[PDB]
Amino acid sequence: AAKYAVVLKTLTDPFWVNMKKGIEDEAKKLGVSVDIFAAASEGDAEAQKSLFESLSNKNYKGIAFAPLTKDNLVEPVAAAWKKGTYLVNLDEKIDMKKLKAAGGAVEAFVTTDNVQVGAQGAGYIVQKLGAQGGEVAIIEGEAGNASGEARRTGATDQFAKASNIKLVASQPADWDRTKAKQVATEILAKNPNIKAIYCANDTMALGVADAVADAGKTGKVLVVGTDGIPEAQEAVKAGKMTATVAQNPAAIGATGLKLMVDAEKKAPQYVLVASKLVTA
C-alpha cells in the first residue's frame, strides 16, 4: 500500500504532468508506492482543499502538496501535521503564518528560486557574448511582482559580475507580449548596439523576438525568456529565441518524494531545484 501521497495542481498543462512523471520515476528508483492526486476542476481552490481533506482517513506517512493559493490548503495541512504526517510543500509557498496560527507546520519546502532563474538567464547571455561582452537589457514583469522582481534582481546581479557587460535598460512590460514588443523596440532604437535581452517571462520574450525581427536583427540580438512555455520552446528551436529558463517540475516532485521517503527511514528544510536552460 502507499505510505506517500502527493496533491498536485490540475494535470491540464505539461508542468504538472511532468511533475507527476518525475514523482513516478523517483518512486520506481526508490521502490515505493505513491498516490498522486489532482483535482479535475482547474483553478479551483476549494476542490483542491476538499481533495486534500479526503486523504485524512487514509494512513499516509507523508504528503507532498503544491497549493493552488498560499491559503487554500492551510487547514488540511494543519490537520495533517497534527496527525504526525510528514509534509512537503512543493512549488508555491503555503502561508506559513496562517499555518502556524492553525497549529501546523511543514517539514520541507521544495521550489525554484526565481533569483537563480534570472541569474541563469543572464549567465547564459554572459557566456554567449564571450570575451567581447556588450550591451544587454532586461524586460521586466509588472513592477513589484515577487517572481518578476526576483528574476530582475538575479539577472541584474549576474550581469553586474561581468565588467564588460553593460545593462543599458531594465524596463517593465507587465507580462504583456504587445507591450514587450514596444519596450524592446524602444530599447533597440536607443541602444542599436544591444547584444542581448533577458525577459522575465516567455510571453514577453516572444514579443521581444517580434521587435527584434521587425528591426531586422534576428540572431544578432540574443533573446532569452523564462518559463519554457511551448511557443517559446518552438521559438528556440526555430532560432526566433536564443533560450528560455524553464523550471524542472520533474525534479521538484522527485525531490519532494525523496524527502518524504528519507524522513521515514523547527524551521522547514528549504530545497531549491535549479531551473534548466532550454537551448537549440
Side-chain angles (χ1 to χ4, degrees), residues 6-9 15-16 18-26 30 64-67 88-93 108-114 116-117 151 246-260 271-276:
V6 184
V7 180
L8 301 179
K9 300 191 199 182
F15 184 97
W16 300 105
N18 290 334
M19 182 167 305
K20 173 168 188 173
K21 298 192 161 172
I23 298 158
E24 289 168 339
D25 290 325
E26 185 69 16
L30 301 174
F65 64 91
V88 179
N89 186 176
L90 306 175
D91 185 33
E92 169 175 3
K93 186 159 124 167
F109 178 43
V110 183
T111 192
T112 303
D113 176 358
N114 278 303
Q116 184 180 208
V117 166
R151 291 167 192 172
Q247 292 194 74
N248 188 347
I252 290 174
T255 297
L257 176 59
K258 191 175 192 309
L259 290 167
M260 294 193 291
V271 178
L272 297 177
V273 173
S275 52
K276 293 265 207 73

